[PDB]
Design a binder for this molecule. Structure first.
Ligand SMILES: CC(=O)Nc1nc(F)c(CN2CC[C@H](OCc3noc(C)n3)C[C@@H]2C)s1
Ligand SMILES: CC(=O)Nc1nc(F)c(CN2CC[C@H](OCc3noc(C)n3)C[C@@H]2C)s1
Lengths: 450, 451
C-alpha cells in the first residue's frame, strides 16, 4: 500500500534554496517520510509565467535538485499551475503545457501535478463553447497531460474546490467535484486541505464525505503550519487535529509548512511521528520528542592561556517556551496562553494595588516577572547559540516577542510601584518606541502615544 | 596597477546563499568590478569556531562558490577571524590556523585575509610574556600565515583599530598602528573604514593621515550601506561622501552592504559608477542610472480566449520614492525628508484648524495625504509585480513604512476634522495596532497606548 507522506513547498513567499531543500531531503529520509511536492507560488515559471521554459541556469538547478531527491529516496513531484490565464480549448496552450513538462521531465522528473488552486471560476467564451463546465475543461487537460506523460505512477490534481468551504454549494452536492470524480482518470490523485484552507481538525467523516463525490481516497495538502497569511506568525507546535484513523482513509499527507525553513523542524518531525505512530499518537508526546531531537541541532587551553569562546547553551526549557510562544493557528501553547492570561488579570485587577486580593496580585505579579525574565533568558541564549542558520530564520519573531515582553514587564512593575510613586508610565519613554530606527521610527515618535 | 573593487560580505546576520553569491558575481563582472571578500560574521567556522574544519557538505559548497568566482573573473578572498580566543604564543594555535586555510586553499582559493576587527584589546598572560603588545602578536601571526601561504598576490589584514574613532589615542600617534606600519610585511594590505565604523564622508586628508602611520595606501572596507546595527534601517541610497580623488590614494574599495541581498543593487551599481567615473562622479546622476537599470529587474490570445496574466508595473517614480524612504545612514532622501517635514509642520500647526494660515494648513494636509497614498501605491505595485522576491528581501521595511504611514495619514485626517467631529483619536483603533497578529500582538493590544 503506497502512501505519500512528506512536504509540499506550496506557499507564497521567498522559495527555499538548494542548500535548504537538500537538507529537507536528508531529514525526510531519516524520519522515514517519502515525498516532496515542488509547488512554490513565487517560482514565476511555476504559475505566473507557467508557459516560459526554464533558463540554462534554472535547468542545472532543477537537475541538481531532482538528483538530490533521488539520492535520498524522496519522490520529487513537479507541480504546474496554468489556471490563471490558460485557454483550455486552445491546442497551442495544451502543447505549451506539454513542452513545459517535457523540459522538467528531461531534468529527470518522473512525478507530476496539475494545480488549479486559487483561480477565477469564470471561463473565457472560447472555452464555454467547448466544455460544459470549468471542471470539464480542467479534467480534459489533466487527463490529456497524464496520458501524454505515459500515465506516471505518481500524478496529482489539485481542484479549485480543494476544501469544504470552497465547495459550491457544499462537498456532497458539488457539480464541480461530481465531474472530477466521474471524469478524472482513476490513476490520478486528488489534493484536499480538509474543511478549510487551514483546517483546525480534519474529521474522519469529512474525508468519507469528499471520498464519495471524488470517488477515491484523497492526498491531504495540509496547511496547519503554513504562515504566509500573516508576516507576524510562526507555528512551531505539533501536528494536531488529524486522527491516525485518517491514514487507511487517505492516499497521503503533504504538509505545507512555515515560509522560514528552519522553523519547520517540529512540523515535519511530528508529522513523521504521526505517520509511524501505529494508530496511537499524542501531540504532547510527539512535541517533546521533536523538541528533544531539535536541541541537538543547537550545539584545551592552559591557566595563563586564552579561554575558548563559550556561550551559556540553549536548554530544552527554552525550546518548550519558544514552541509555546509560536504554537498553532488556533491555539497558543500552555506557557504562552498562561502568560497572556496572567497579563490580562494583572492589568484588569491593578486597582487593588493603586487584603488577600492584594496578596494574590503581588504573588501573580512576581510569578509573571519571572515568566518575563525566562522569555529574555530564552532570547539571549538563542541569540548566542552555535547554529546561526536556525537563529536567523526565526530572529525577527523572537526579537519582536522579547521587545513587547520587556515593555509588559516594565508596565507590570510600574503598576506595582503605584502605592509608593506618582510617576507616570509612558510608552514614549520605553526603548522599543523611543530608540526605533529608520524614517518609520521618526514618524512613529510623532504619533500621539499616551 | 591592481585595484580591488567590489563587495565584502562582512556583516552580522543571515549569510547570503549560493544562488545569491553566483548572482553577485554575474553583476560584479557586468559592472566591471573585480573583488569579493568572503567574511560572514555568522559563518560559525569563519569566526566563532575558526578552528573547526569545514564538513564535506560545506567543502562542496565552498568549491562550487570558488569555481563560480573564477567563472566570472572575480577575485575570491577568504577571510578568517581568530581574534576572540586565539593564544598567539601557542604553536598549536598557529598550525590550526594554517590547517584551516590549507583546507580552503584545497577548495581552489588563492587569496586570503586575517581579520582582527571587534575584539577585546586585552591579551592573555601567556601572550604578554611573548609579545610587547597586541599589535606585535597580530603582525607576528599575520606575517607567518602570509609567508606560509607562499606570499599570495592578494592578502589582507584588518586591524583592531580599523577607523579613526577606534585609534588610541588618535590615528597619527597610535602605537598599535605604529607597530602595524613598521612590522607588517609590505605585500599585505590594510583594511580601513575611514573616520568612523560607518563613515559619513572619507576625506582625502584622513587617508593621508592613516597612510603615513600604516606606511601604505589602504583598502577601504566601506560600511556606508551596512544595516546590521539596526533591525529597522535599510540603505538604498547612492555611494556618497567619497571623492574619486581617493582612488589613486587607495589599494581598493570593498563595500559591506545591507544584509538583504536584493537591497544592494543601488549600493553596488553606484560604487561601480564611482569607480569608473574618470574623476567626475555625481551621487544623484548615479542613483538615477542605478534606479533605471534596477527597474528592468522588476519585469497572443484571441478576443474570446483568456487574456495573459498581466500586472500593473512598478514605475521609476515608485523606485525613486522607495530609495528616498530607505536612503543613507546620515540622510533621508528628498521625498522622505519632505514627508517628515510636512508631518512635523502639520502636527506643530494643528491649532489653526483645532485665515490664510488655515488655507496653508489644509493645502499642506491635502498634499501630505497624496504623498501618503503614493507610498501605499508603491507598496501595492511592488507586492504585485513579476519579481515578488526583491520585495520579499525588503518586506519587513516596506510593510513597516506603509503601516506607520497609514496611521500618520489617519492622524492628519483626524486633526483636520477637529473643528466638526468631537471623536477621539486612538492608536488602538488603528488597523496596524488592532489587527497585529501573533501572541506578540495580543500582548501589544494590552499595553497602555493612549494612557
Ligand atoms: C491547495 C492549497 O491549499 N493551496 C495553497 N496555496 C497556498 F499558497 C497556500 C498558502 N496560503 C496562501 C495564503 C492564504 O491566505 C488566505 C487565508 N485563508 O485562510 C487564512 C487563515 N488565510 C492561506 C494559505 C494557507 S495553500
Ligand atoms: C572592519 C569592519 O568594519 N568590520 C565590520 N564587521 C561588521 F560585522 C560590520 C558591520 N557592522 C557591525 C555592527 C556595528 O554595530 C555597532 C553598533 N552600534 O550600535 C549598535 C547597537 N551596534 C556596525 C557595523 C557597520 S563592519
Amino acid at each position: 500500500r503506497r502512501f505519500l507522506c512528506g512536504v509540499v513547498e506550496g506557499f507564497y513567499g521567498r522559495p527555499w534554496v538548494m542548500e535548504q531543500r537538500k537538507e529537507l531531503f536528508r531529514r525526510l529520509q531519516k524520519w522515514e517520510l517519502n515525498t516532496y511536492l515542488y509547488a512554490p507560488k513565487d517560482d514565476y515559471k511555476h504559475r505566473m509565467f507557467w508557459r516560459e521554459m526554464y533558463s540554462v541556469e534554472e535547468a542545472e538547478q532543477l537537475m541538481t535538485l531532482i538528483s538530490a531527491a533521488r539520492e535520498y529516496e524522496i519522490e520529487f513531484i513537479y507541480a504546474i499551475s496554468p489556471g490563471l490565464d490558460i485557454t483550455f480549448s486552445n491546442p497551442k496552450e495544451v502543447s505549451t503545457l506539454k513542452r513545459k513538462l517535457d523540459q522538467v521531465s528531461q531534468f529527470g522528473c518522473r512525478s507530476f501535478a496539475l494545480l488549479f488552486d486559487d483561480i477565477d471560476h469564470n471561463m473565457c467564451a472560447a472555452d464555454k463553447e467547448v466544455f460544459s463546465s470549468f471542471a470539464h475543461a480542467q479534467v480534459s487537460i489533466t487527463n490529456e497531460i497524464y496520458q501524454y506523460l505515459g500515465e506516471p505512477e505518481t500524478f496529482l490534481f489539485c481542484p479549485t474546490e480543494y476544501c469544504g468551504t470552497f465547495c459550491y454549494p457544499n462537498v456532497s452536492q458539488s457539480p464541480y467535484l461530481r465531474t472530477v470524480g466521474e471524469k478524472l482518470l482513476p490513476g490520478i490523485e486528488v489534493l484536499w486541505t480538509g474543511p478549510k484552507v487551514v483546517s483546525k481538525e480534519i474529521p474522519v467523516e469529512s474525508i468519507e464525505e469528499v471520498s464519495k463525490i471524488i470517488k477515491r481516497a484523497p492526498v491531504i495538502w495540509d496547511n496547519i503550519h503554513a504562515n504566509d497569511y500573516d508576516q507576524k506568525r510562526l507555528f512551531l507546535g505539533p501536528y494536531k487535529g488529524r486522527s491516525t484513523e485518517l491514514i487507511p482513509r487517505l492516499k497521503g499527507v503533504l504538509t505545507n509548512p512555515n515560509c522560514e525553513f528552519e522553523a519547520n523542524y517540529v512540523a515535519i518531525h511530528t508529522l513523521a511521528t504521526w505517520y509511524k505512530s501505529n494508530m496511537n499518537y499524542s501531540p504532547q508526546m510527539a512535541l517533546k520528542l521533536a523538541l528533544t531531537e531539535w536541541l541537538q541541532e543547537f550545539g584545551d587551553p592552559g591557566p595563563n592561556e586564552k579561554p575558548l569562546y563559550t556561550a551559556e547553551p540553549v536548554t530544552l526549557e527554552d525550546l518548550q517556551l519558544l514552541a509555546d510562544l509560536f504554537y498553532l493557528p488556533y491555539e497558543h501553547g500552555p506557557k504562552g496562553a498562561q502568560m497572556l492570561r496572567e497579563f490580562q488579570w494583572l492589568r484588569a485587577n491593578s486597582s487593588v494595588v493603586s487584603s488577600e486580593k492584594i496578596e494574590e496580585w503581588r504573588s501573580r505579579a512576581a510569578k509573571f516577572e519571572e515568566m518575563c525574565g525566562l522569555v529574555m533568558g530564552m532570547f539571549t541564549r538563542l541569540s548566542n547559540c552555535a547554529n546561526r542558520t536556525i537563529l536567523y530564520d526565526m530572529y525577527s519573531y523572537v526579537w519582536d516577542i522579547k521587545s513587547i515582553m520587556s515593555m509588559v514587564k516594565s508596565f507590570v512593575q510600574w503598576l506595582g510601584e503605584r502605592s509608593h510613586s506618582s510617576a507616570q508610565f509612558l510608552i514614549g519613554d520605553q526603548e522599543p518606541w523611543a530608540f526605533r530606527g529608520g524614517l518609520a521610527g521618526e514618524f512613529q515618535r510623532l504619533l500621539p502615544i499616551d
